[PDB]
Amino acid sequence: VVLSFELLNAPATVCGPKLSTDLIKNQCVNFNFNGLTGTGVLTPSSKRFQ
């Protein structure tokens, strides 16, 4: 199986995977959940999302 890789003048159509970080809970740390930036303590509760 020959994989022909090319780097011609074209936008980045195919890229590598995007490894996510670990879930640091109970600590005031920076968070980035796909655009949602800021700083807070990741703690669960008893809410019911849709």
Add this chain to the structure above:
Amino acid sequence: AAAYFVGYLKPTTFMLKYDENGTITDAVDCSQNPLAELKCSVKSFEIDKG
């Protein structure tokens, strides 16, 4: 039988109640009567006298 029951819409304002467990079950359109506009103004469904 067969009935379409299609109705147009106009840009207006609404006061949505957000009950627990992620539900609405009640809304008020502030474009029909002055009582609805008063309810939307003070943000309450039970208006006192005055």
Add this chain to the structure above:
Amino acid sequence: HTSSMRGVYYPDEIFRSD
């Protein structure tokens, strides 16, 4: 020909408390 409090949909995907 009358929509008696009908047509209320979620305008977004944001969960809100009481």
